[PDB]
Symmetry: C2
Subunit: 100 residues, 2 copies
Amino acid sequence: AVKHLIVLKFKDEITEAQKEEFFKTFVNLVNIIPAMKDVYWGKDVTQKNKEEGYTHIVEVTFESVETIQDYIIHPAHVGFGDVYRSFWEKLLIFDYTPRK
Amino acid sequence: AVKHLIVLKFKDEITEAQKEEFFKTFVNLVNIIPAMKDVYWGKDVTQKNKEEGYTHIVEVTFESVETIQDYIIHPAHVGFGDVYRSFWEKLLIFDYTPRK
């Protein structure tokens, strides 16, 4: 399985309630985008690199690297971006196959 | 469960074989550090983050936020840093509880 990892910082003006609604909406995308198999998110608790400012993590599970693209251009994902684009200040994205 | 996420970039002179052995050794820490419950790593394939350059992800599972400290100061973890810190150029650390 492939992981789509999002590391993000919200803009200062976004409230806690707004962040909660943002993540709730994103988690619920799993039901309507076939390529999305699972979602978890969380807030960093350690603040080891404050200077970089990232605060939140989202992890999305996919069957393959190829199905990530199905998710990217799915109208529900495009709609999510259209609605919440103003919420985030910056993000890092990674796509990888977990191994050990 | 709490996840301990390491986001890394290697120095340019580090070989592919060195990277593989680095992760093999890191994964094997589970056997000698009780607090480590699981580990996976992976290499980003998308390279969508222009200015930051991080290439690899390590995720370690812990039973609680408290047991992360048992890993942090464990001599096997300190030793890993002493042997391999010259391998990485920079790293970001995050600790979070995955949720819906």
